[PDB]
From TrEMBL, chain A:
It is found in: Nucleus, Nuclear pore complex. Belongs to the nucleoporin NSP1/NUP62 family. The gene is nup62. This is Nuclear pore protein.
UniProtKB/TrEMBL annotation, chain C:
The lineage of its organism: Eukaryota, Amoebozoa, Evosea, Eumycetozoa, Dictyostelia. This is Uncharacterized protein. Belongs to the NUP186/NUP192/NUP205 family. It is found in: Nucleus. It comes from the Eukaryota.
Amino acid sequence: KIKSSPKDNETTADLERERIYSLATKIDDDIIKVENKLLGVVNKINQNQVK
Amino acid sequence: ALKRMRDLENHLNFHIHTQLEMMRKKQIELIQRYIEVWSNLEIYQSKGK
Amino acid sequence: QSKKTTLENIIKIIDYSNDQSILIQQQIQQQQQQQQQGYNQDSSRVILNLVFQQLQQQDNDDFNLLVLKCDYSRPIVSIAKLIDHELPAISLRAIRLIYSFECYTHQISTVFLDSDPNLILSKFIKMMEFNESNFEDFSGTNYDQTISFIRYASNSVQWTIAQLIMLCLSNISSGRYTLAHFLLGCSSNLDLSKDFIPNSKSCLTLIIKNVMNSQFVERYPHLVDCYHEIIWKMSSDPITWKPMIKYIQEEFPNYYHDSLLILRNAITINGSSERRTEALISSMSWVFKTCSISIQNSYSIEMKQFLTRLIFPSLMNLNQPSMSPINILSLYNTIEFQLPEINRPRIFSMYPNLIEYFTTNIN
C-alpha cells in the first residue's frame, strides 16, 4: 500500500524525511551488527576460560 | 525408562533448541522489516507536509 | 509467492528423486524404459553439485575468518535417503554433502536418531558390504576417463564413509557421542560405557569382517590401514576401550592372529608397490598397539595360547599332533628396518626461498 503511491510533488520536508526515517532503519541494522560482534567477543571469552 | 528419558532430553537439547534459534533469528529478520515498513509508512502518510 | 518457491522447488526435486529411486528399485522388475530416467537423474546430480557449491564457500578459511570479524534435519535426511542411490555419482554426492554438514554441526548423530536411525544406518551398511565380483584390475595403462570415473565413483563410497567415521573419532572431546559412534553402533542411550550388541549389523561388524577378508586387504590396503585406525581409536579412548576390546574377544577372538597372518602375507607378495607396503606396515602398527591394550587390561586364555604357541613358541610343543610361522623374530623382519635414504628434492635447489611454502607439516 506504500510502494504503490506516486513519487509526484516531493518537497524539502519529504526529501529530508525520506533521509531521516531511513537513518532510523540504518540505526537498527548497525545496532544488530554490534550486538552480533559483541556476542562474537563474549562467546570467545567464555571459550577461553573453559579451554 | 532411563533410555526413553535420554531420548526425550536429546530432542529438547538439540532439535527443539535448533527450532528455538531458527525462530529467535527469524524474529530479528521480522523486527528489522517492521522498522523498514513503519519508516516507509511515516514518510508516505506525512508526504507533502 | 514466486520469491520463496526457488529453494522449495529444489527440495521437492530431492524428495521426488527419492520417490523415483524407490519407484525405480521397484520398477526395474519391469522397465525397458531407462531412456526416460536420465533427465531426472542428471537434474538430481546437478542439484547435488549446486548445494555442494553453496557449501564450498563456507568450507573456507576466508569465510570463517570473515565471521570472526563481522531445521536442517529434513534437508539432511532427504539427502541421506540417497546414500544407496543406483548411480554411485549421486551416492558419493549425498555422502560428501553429509561430510561437510557434520563439519559445521557435529550433530548428524542426533538428526539421524530424531528421524529413523534404522532406515539411515542400513543405507551406510548397504554401501559398506563388500562385493568381490565388482572387480577387474587397474593394471591396464589405457585409463579411459569415462569407465574410470564410474569405478572411482564406486570405490570412493567406502573410502568416504571410512573417512566420515574417522573425522568423528578425531574430533572427540571425551565422552561425546558422534556420527562415528552412531555408524559403529555404540549404545543409543548415547552411552559409551555400555557394551556393543552381539550379532548386530553396524559399520563396526563390517569393518572387522572386511579386515579379516584377505582379498579385501590385497585389493584395498589404504582402506584397511584406515579401518585399523578406527579399531585402534575405539580401543584407546579411555571410555570405549572396554566395550570395544570385550566385543573383539566375544565375537572375534582370533583377530590379533588372523590380521597379523593376512597383513604379513600381503606384505610378503613381491612386485607390490611402495604405497601398498606403506599402508600394510601402517596397519600392522595398529594391530600391535590394539593387541598391547588387550594384553595389558584383558589377558585371556586365547591371549595365553596366542603368545605361548605362536609369538614365543617354546620348542617342546612342536612334537604333539593332538589338535614360516608368526613368531616375535619373523614379525620383526617383516617390517624391513632398511629405511629408504630420502634424497633432497631438486626443486629445493631451484627455489631455496620457498622450502617452507612447498612443504606441509603432518602434525
